[PDB]
């Protein structure tokens, strides 16, 4: 279960924030938020993305959804405003009205969805027409170093290529506006003499993981009703 898999990550939630911020800061800066916008953060973890959007773009209302009750208890404890709220929920059934959200953000969570295609349809449903979904992931086909992550995770993960993310967004009714790789330039890469480390056999592989592949970002836009 989600709470079984991620409660140890809530005992480490700040550690995920510190690592993920290296690329999330760039993806968040791209979001076309207008002051006062309502944002839903799917798999909020420590809730940092909502706090960053309020501090830098002035969102008005934020909802940090997580399937781990411990995770959202933590996220709330780290937040100094009631304009950003937290709730327990699941990616397969979003507890928001149709066309009620201006933008949806998700970092390092989407690929744990049980039915990712249905989650995309749920995102298109809750978004207002013209609203955006910013989907940032480190587990994807081209990032060869991530393939082994499934070996230490009990949840069945979805491993899609860049093309598969674009195709799935279109199949859910979202228009793809942008797709990119965001490098992690902050993580220290030791000298070639220091290898192997616990994670890397060669410096070349570490450089490829972080400076070349980085985080995949796909941006979708929810459409108005149209002829089918």
């Amino acid at each position: 279960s989600v709470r079984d898999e991620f409660d140890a990550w809530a005992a480490r939630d700040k550690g995920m924030e510190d690592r993920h911020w290296h690329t999330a800061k760039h993806a968040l800066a791209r979001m076309p938020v207008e002051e006062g916008d309502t944002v839903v953060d799917l798999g909020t973890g420590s809730g940092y993305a909502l706090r960053a959007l309020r501090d830098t773009k002035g969102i008005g209302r934020g909802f940090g959804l997580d399937g781990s009750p411990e995770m959202v208890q933590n996220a709330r404890a780290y937040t100094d405003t009631d304009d950003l709220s937290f709730l327990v929920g699941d990616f397969d059934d979003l507890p928001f009205d149709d066309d009620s959200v201006d933008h949806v953000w998700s970092m390092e969570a989407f690929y744990y969805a049980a039915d990712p295609h249905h989650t995309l349809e749920e995102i298109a449903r809750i978004l207002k027409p013209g609203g955006t979904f910013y989907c940032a992931v480190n587990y994807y086909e081209e990032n060869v170093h991530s393939h082994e992550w499934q070996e230490h995770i009990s949840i069945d993960m979805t491993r899609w290529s860049h093309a598969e993310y674009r195709e799935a967004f279109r199949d859910a009714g979202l228009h793809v506006a942008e797709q990119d790789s965001i490098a992690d330039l902050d993580i220290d890469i030791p000298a070639a003499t220091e290898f192997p480390t616990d994670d890397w056999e060669t410096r070349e592989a570490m450089v490829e993981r972080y400076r070349t592949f980085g985080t995949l970002l796909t941006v979708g836009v929810a459409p108005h009703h149209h002829h089918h």
Binding site: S1, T38, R61, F63, G67, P69, V72, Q73, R76, D82, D83, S85, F86, L87, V88, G89, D90, D92, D93, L94, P95, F96, D97, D98, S100, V101
Partner: protein
């Protein structure tokens, strides 16, 4: 959770309207009840638990 933020929340099962019941209030303790399903989603320490029942 701020009561005003609950305006766009819906039952995760069928996406119908919820009814709010307050015990401690910014809502700290209480429940959100499904108007069609009768499901009870608790709010504990300001956090609503809106998982579908079986989760």
């Amino acid at each position: 959770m701020k009561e005003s933020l609950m305006d766009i929340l819906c039952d995760p099962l069928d996406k119908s309207e919820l009814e709010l019941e307050v015990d401690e209030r910014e809502i700290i303790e209480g429940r959100l009840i499904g108007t069609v399903t009768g499901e009870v989603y608790p709010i504990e320490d300001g956090i609503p638990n809106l998982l579908p029942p079986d989760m």
